[PDB]
Copies of this chain bind each other. A is one copy, B any other.
Amino acid sequence: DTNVKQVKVLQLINAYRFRGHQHANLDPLGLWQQDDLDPSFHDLTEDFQETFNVGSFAETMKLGELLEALKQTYCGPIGAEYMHITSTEEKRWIQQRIESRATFNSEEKKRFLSELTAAEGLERYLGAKFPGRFSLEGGDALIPMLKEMIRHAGNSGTREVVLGMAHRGRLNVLVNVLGKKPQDLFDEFAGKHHLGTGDVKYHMGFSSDFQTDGGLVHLALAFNPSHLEIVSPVVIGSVRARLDRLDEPSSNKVLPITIHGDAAVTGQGVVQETLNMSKARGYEVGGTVRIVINNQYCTDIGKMVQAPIFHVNADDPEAVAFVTRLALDFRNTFKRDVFIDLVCYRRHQPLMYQKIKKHPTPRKIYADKLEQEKVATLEDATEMVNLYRDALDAGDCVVAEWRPMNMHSFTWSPYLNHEWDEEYPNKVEMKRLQELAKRISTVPEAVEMQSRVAKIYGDRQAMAAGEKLFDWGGAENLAYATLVDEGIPVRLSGEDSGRGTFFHRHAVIHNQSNGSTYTPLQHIHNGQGAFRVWDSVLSEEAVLAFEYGYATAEPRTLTIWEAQFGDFANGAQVVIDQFISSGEQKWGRMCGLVMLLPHGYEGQGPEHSSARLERYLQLCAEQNMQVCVPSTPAQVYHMLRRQALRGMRRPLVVMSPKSLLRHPLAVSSLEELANGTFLPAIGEIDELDPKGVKRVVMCSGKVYYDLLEQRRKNNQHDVAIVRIEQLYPFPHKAMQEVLQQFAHVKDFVWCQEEPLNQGAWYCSQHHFREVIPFGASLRYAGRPASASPAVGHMSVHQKQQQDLVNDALNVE
């Protein structure tokens, strides 16, 4: 009897919660094919005036009334699928919100109508004027949705919003949300304009302020390439930077919004990578609001994590508004990714095309409704449509709440139009240097050090005191000290980067007592730059994108990304190709990201030998990047400081050393640190009688030391060996300084560890030629060309190293 039935009703409430969404009126076309637990009878009833307890269903209700309420709640225009989430209080939170809506009022409804009108009217104006649809029609409700999202952010103390989307709807969002001048857009179509090489109109970002009741929000819409889905981790990178510059930096204060298409989101693996990474300390941003523009489920990746998915019918702006707040409230409340599945169509399987043509547009559907509610007449709707058309004709901003940015919002202005060779405060006063050298070498006794580490630290105290030369790690960390000391923050990010893949850095010290850590660079003085090191793992495409976004938002911070080995960075080729190396020219976007790519031929094989130097060199042009191969601790130290101290903001690609990290000749003095500078080139270091010199060898990086040791060994005085430490921009001045004593030499050799089709030969040939004397010939010494970067077998490597070295040194 009735005991048993009460239990059955609970089971029925439950089934609606779980799966009600699958019978929801989501599709605006009504051609969706809904494929159980949902009819009473499967749960054995008939009965509808029997009164029941209704469990947690936001006390007592006649049955048939409950079934009403459940169908409303879970089977109308919103499909909440949300009971996979394990947090009890989150579900209950949601239930509370949806299981109890107030009505919007005449002015909010009208306003919805107004934004649908703009959505449509812009799409139509552009159709008529420029018959060449990435039109938003009809996912028109995106405009009302974004505008509401932003208003709600305002009223919840959000200060900035960062957006990334793609092409569909792009022009609409630009004009009707971000506030770009229609006239500016119309001009773009006519070919009226930038002073780089540019990109197409659908990749355009935009920055503005937007006035809400709750205050002034900053809007930032990303630039992006045609490659789908990769702007995402760029955005959230962007937002971590912006959070990192607030004084108490709570997530709700910067909101990331990403807009996706159904196919891209299931089909692009950077989505997985991004979800995985947003979990990680040093990368989290308190969750992203993800909008899926659902045309042709797809949101099913959002269960690899576990996030609420709100599906909604684009044809109901009111339901759309409601879900918008719901999703936003949820994310600001619980610091978690949320998904809004915006279910719509492309006005622009010819069986549904016919469906679409006979279907009224969202503006139309809504104005008809506001008319059968006596909230706006035809004459009202019609005049919204006339007003908007007129405004387009006038060409001015059409977003009433757009405000021009304040001076203080222009964070990049100091950093534009600088050249690589500008002067910068290279020197640091010896007293202060040693003071810092000593502080970062000195670990409170509280911290129990592992044995090998404690040694390394004893060494660095001895470097500080002049009693021992700096190695790479000692000098590198000293660079960071000198930067944070004067207020410049550092962010270092990479696989195992706190200690170092090669055990060289030990910026972070693992306590053997507490199991905690201590990071010396964080304890210099009150009010220093922050210093933060973050250990990635994998997700390498998403990570570099993130750091690119970060460096892009924040030019005051020295932002470093370190690949385990350079060989792996091709996992991020799209970032390197579409953003880092080309973003300035395409988009005007500066970036001082530093990339540490361990690189060097040491016999460990094809994926542990080559950063593919040559690929970065071919990408170089128009001063776009710097490519450096530092050979000394002093060099790395000056190199990093230059990047921070010196105005320009352009990617620094570094061929980082592995074995040089402990080479006994790779070693530097305090005098070289304090009074030295970054040297684009380094001349011959030994005494040779220049009149006796028959050959100059030029080279970069570790192979230098092999040549040096071999030439000393041979007792040889007739061949000089010069380093080129910066291959791009190519340092002509420096080159003529180190070459002047050799004006009379006719035999010049470029020597490289790397194979002929690789390293610098093919790309930097023409520079070498510009720089050697008018007489001189120029020839190659190095490994033969090869399909694989590096041979498999150590004995073969060793023979090749010896052979290329002897060949360089051999004048016979």
> Which residues of A are in contact with B by a Cβ distance under 8 Å?
1, 3-4, 7-8, 191, 193-194, 196-200, 225-228, 263-264, 266-273, 276, 300-301, 303-306, 350-351, 512, 515, 537-539, 541-542, 567-568, 570-571, 573-574, 577-578, 581-582, 584-586, 604-608, 612, 614-615, 618-622, 624-625, 755-758, 762-763, 765, 785-796
Q: Which 6 A-B pairs have the closest CB atoms?
A: A269-B269, A198-B792, A267-B538, A573-B573, A624-B787, A226-B607
Q: Closest residue of chain B to A188, judged by CB? A: B793
Residues of chain B lying within 8 A (CB to CB) of residue A794 = 191
Total copies of the chain: 2
Q: Are B200 and A792 in contact (CB under 8 A)?
A: yes
Majority SS at the chain A contact face: loop
Q: Closest residue of chain B to A607, judged by CB? A: B226
Residues of chain B lying within 8 A (CB to CB) of residue A304 = 266, 300-301, 303-304
Q: Are A226 and B567 in contact (CB under 8 A)?
A: yes
Q: Closest residue of chain B to A570, judged by CB? A: B573
Residues of chain B lying within 8 A (CB to CB) of residue A795 = 191
Residues of chain B lying within 8 A (CB to CB) of residue A512 = 350
Question: A8 is contacted by which of B7, B264, B584 (Cβ under 8 Å)?
Answer: B7
Q: Are B571 and A574 in contact (CB under 8 A)?
A: yes
Given A304-B303, A795-B191; A539-B269 close (CB under 8 Å)? yes
Residues of chain B lying within 8 A (CB to CB) of residue A585 = 786-788
Q: Are B191 and A582 in contact (CB under 8 A)?
A: no
Residues of chain B lying within 8 A (CB to CB) of residue A792 = 194, 197-200, 586
Residues of chain B lying within 8 A (CB to CB) of residue A3 = 1, 3-4
Question: A227 is contacted by which of B197, B225, B607, B612 (Cβ under 8 Å)?
Answer: B607
Residues of chain B lying within 8 A (CB to CB) of residue A268 = 269, 272-273, 538-539
Q: Closest residue of chain B to A584, judged by CB? A: B787
A621 to chain B, nearest CB (A): 4
User: How far apart sit A577 and B606, CA to CA, in the bound complex (Å)?
Assistant: 10
Having A226-B606, A621-B786, one finds 8 other A-B pairs with CB under 8 Å, namely A197-B788, A225-B606, A225-B607, A263-B538, A350-B512, A582-B787, A582-B789, A614-B618
A766 to chain B, nearest CB (A): 8
Residues of chain B lying within 8 A (CB to CB) of residue A194 = 792
Q: Are A605 and B541 in contact (CB under 8 A)?
A: no
Residues of chain B lying within 8 A (CB to CB) of residue A605 = 199-200, 226
17 contacts between A and B (CB under 8 A): A3-B4, A199-B605, A199-B606, A199-B792, A200-B605, A200-B792, A267-B276, A267-B538, A267-B539, A268-B538, A300-B306, A570-B578, A578-B606, A586-B792, A615-B618, A618-B758, A620-B757
A155 to chain B, nearest CB (A): 35
Residues of chain B lying within 8 A (CB to CB) of residue A276 = 266-267
User: How far apart sit A795 and B227, CA to CA, in the bound complex (Å)?
Assistant: 24
